[model samples]
Target: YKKPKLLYCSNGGHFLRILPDGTVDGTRDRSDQHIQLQLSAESVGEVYIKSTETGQYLAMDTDGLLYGSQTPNEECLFLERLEENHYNTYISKKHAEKNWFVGLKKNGSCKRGPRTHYGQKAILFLPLPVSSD
Candidate 1:
């Protein structure tokens, strides 16, 4: 079904959420609507993570800082990849060669892109369906 999704971080066990203030963070609350996002498919394995509430697209800068972009662009496109652990990893499609991964630290903080790498728990996520109940 084409419903909103919550990205659960493997490291911190937190749900990835973006605020209306444009700040990207992790929330422990499963019912938090801020974590609800619609993953729109752009191509096979290429997608855009857009907030269902704020109308902003999830983006990462060259420095690997995660933020909400008002307008969709190259930075907003992410290549969704399935890892060996049955989890998923989202890398910046525009910077795919650099291998910048969307990361969340074990302490429930946003991990900077430049410091993230494959096989790290911080770089892996489990995409789950949003619960309305």
Candidate 2:
């Protein structure tokens, strides 16, 4: 099976996925199903949305990164695919803060092609419930 090459972001509270073609395929709020490993203005990284799934980390560069004290209802940031396997994920601070919004922003570069080759592997992301502290 062809390996899935996509970018993901999780701030311990929310998660997002970006395809190689520069598309925000996955974006969920207040779900623990998906987990984010790393999120920085320099890059965006993520694993799968499933808690059981493991291996294969995706990373992508971001255009901008901002956080807030509250989480917006639902909003999507623009992601730009850069050359040399680099990407830029952009998000405003207004939408970064909210009870529903969490911390952490994963951004980085990756390689992704047509779905025919990747199949289900092309899935952007999945959302799950947040672990109760």
Candidate 3:
């Protein structure tokens, strides 16, 4: 098993973080409620994005909306795929078999979809450099 790592966006130097205000957003710094998630592996090959800062969980709704939830549920699960660029991909498990992903839209707003309806903007994230040293 691999250790869970923080997913950062190279485009804006942000980390996919869970905020204390009950929302999920990409934060530029790692020292806030906007901190890294400890990806806990599940029995069915999914991971629960748990936060150490706010104790909130990363969850996506059926409407393709993303949220930082205080409670744990099935919507908090995500299927992670490895990309060719060494960064991983995150798809929502909210829809069962649809494979919808959360993308960083125009100007870096968080949005979700199957990519067909949202284009390349839907196939978000390029992963972060593991170490900054």
Candidate 4:
């Protein structure tokens, strides 16, 4: 006969779980680079990009969708609008900044409130490139 062991679970706020393959998974409510997205008709709104480290979530707009890339590049397309108000946040900023590298200066201004250790949410509206096609 095999013996069973009892397991326990508790609400330990929020934490991240790194997998054996060096991939991060599980719930990470508070991340150093928590970049969010927002969309509007006139301009792209400011979304929160709270992180523990400096220059974490870089904000940029692609078409009418909000994006976040890890590094400043023209091919880093990380997160995109999956639904009307829902966005899938990614770990890399290089993806989002590719299509629209308006520079770090413009992206830094969109941040809201005083910097804090806690994670915050921001949404900013910016003009999307005019397309003739």
State residue 87's C-alpha deviation in candidate 1, in Å: 0.5
Q: What's the CA error at residue 22 for candidate 4, in Å?
A: 32
Q: Scored by CA lDDT, what does every candidate get?
A: 0.69, 0.27, 0.57, 0.25
Query: lDDT for model 2, on a 0 to 1 scale?
Result: 0.27
Better of 2 and 3 by TM-score: 3
Candidate 2 lDDT over 1-133, as tens digits, reads 2222223433323335432223333344324423332222232521122111322223222212212112211232322222232322332222334211112323322222212121322222322323333
Q: Output the worst ten-in-a-row residue range by lDDT, candidate 2.
A: 63-72
Query: What are the runs in model 4 whose C-alpha is more than 4 Å off?
Result: 1-77, 82-127
* C-alpha RMSD of each candidate structure in angstroms: 3.1, 16.2, 4.1, 18.8
Pitting candidate 1 against candidate 4, the one with the higher TM-score is 1
Candidate 3: segments with Cα more than 4 A from true spot: 1-4, 105-109, 114-118, 121-133
Question: Could you tell me how far off, in angstroms, the CA of residue 36 lies in candidate 1 after the best superposition?
Answer: 0.6
- Per-candidate TM equals 0.81, 0.19, 0.70, 0.19
Regions of model 1 farther than 4 Å from truth: 11-13, 106-108, 130-133
lDDT of 4: 0.25
